[PDB]
Amino acid sequence: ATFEIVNRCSYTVWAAASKGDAALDAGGRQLNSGESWTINVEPGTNGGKIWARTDCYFDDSGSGICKTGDCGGLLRCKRFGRPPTTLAEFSLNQYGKDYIDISNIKGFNVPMDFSPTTRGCRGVRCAADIVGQCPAKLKAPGGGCNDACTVFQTSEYCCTTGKCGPTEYSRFFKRLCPDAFSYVLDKPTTVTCPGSSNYRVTFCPT
């Protein structure tokens, strides 16, 4: 499957792609304002994620740090990133279909649109100014808007017991971005696409 990652932000971002225990394609790359990077994700990839990283610094070996979404200090991510991270999530070729969504469960750092470039389904988007409107207690000093689980570490926010409800914090993310997951047990906003669809992830779509 092909994923064209486009940075429409006025600032540079370092795209990242991983399935948790391994990188997807190269795993990460720098995207200056306006640049596009097309990656190949193997069919059947389950639990894949694409996200943007901001304010990064990498040496010649590809080692460094990012203020948001840092993945073990690597340019080429092989693991998931450090919150806050707006997440484009997907599982491909699952019994004949693809499943995609955007999630704010791990916070929000950069606005994003995640849409298919092929026929058969709609895209999803979370492009509201979540960082600017972020509740004071969720603001990440390093940048972005943290999710409540990251900040408070409670069973209710992290849904540890598999039993949790919406909260004042989850409702904030849901109000600004109704089409993205605001908490673990949020009413699903997952989109079903034809198996083997291709996609485009656009940072700062508006």
Side-chain angles (χ1 to χ4, degrees):
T2 58
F3 284 72
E4 178 177 47
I5 303 172
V6 182
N7 179 23
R8 189 171 292 153
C9 303
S10 59
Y11 49 84
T12 299
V13 300
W14 283 260
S18 172
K19 67 183 186 66
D21 64 331
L24 295 182
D25 197 284
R29 209 206 81 175
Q30 183 177 323
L31 291 180
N32 293 321
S33 178
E35 299 195 320
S36 301
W37 175 42
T38 299
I39 63 169
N40 288 294
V41 176
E42 179 176 53
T45 290
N46 186 65
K49 302 187 194 302
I50 286 169
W51 68 101
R53 294 173 287 172
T54 62
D55 303 307
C56 305
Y57 296 81
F58 294 111
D59 55 40
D60 307 311
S61 68
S63 297
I65 183 175
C66 297
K67 292 197 174 183
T68 68
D70 189 58
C71 62
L74 303 182
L75 167 61
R76 298 179 61 277
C77 295
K78 61 174 59 182
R79 301 289 182 177
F80 292 138
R82 186 172 188 281
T85 56
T86 314
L87 301 168
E89 311 180 307
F90 49 91
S91 289
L92 317 178
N93 312 97
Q94 299 300 300
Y95 300 111
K97 297 292 183 180
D98 285 2
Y99 294 94
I100 67 172
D101 73 69
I102 288 179
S103 173
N104 284 316
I105 293 175
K106 290 293 177 178
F108 174 106
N109 65 331
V110 178
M112 153 202 290
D113 174 278
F114 183 15
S115 299
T117 53
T118 50
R119 300 166 55 64
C121 60
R122 66 176 182 297
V124 291
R125 178 183 297 191
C126 176
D129 184 20
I130 285 179
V131 178
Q133 304 287 20
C134 189
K137 293 184 176 183
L138 297 186
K139 293 184 177 183
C145 190
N146 292 308
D147 58 282
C149 170
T150 291
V151 179
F152 300 105
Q153 297 283 280
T154 67
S155 294
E156 194 62 19
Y157 297 138
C158 305
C159 213
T160 315
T161 67
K163 300 179 180 179
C164 63
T167 63
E168 192 177 314
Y169 295 123
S170 74
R171 290 192 183 83
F172 158 73
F173 287 98
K174 199 61 169 183
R175 176 170 66 78
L176 272 70
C177 282
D179 298 313
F181 281 83
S182 61
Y183 73 109
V184 179
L185 295 180
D186 201 354
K187 175 179 177 58
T189 45
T190 304
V191 174
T192 302
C193 287
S196 297
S197 293
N198 291 316
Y199 308 89
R200 176 180 290 116
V201 173
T202 307
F203 298 121
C204 298
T206 59

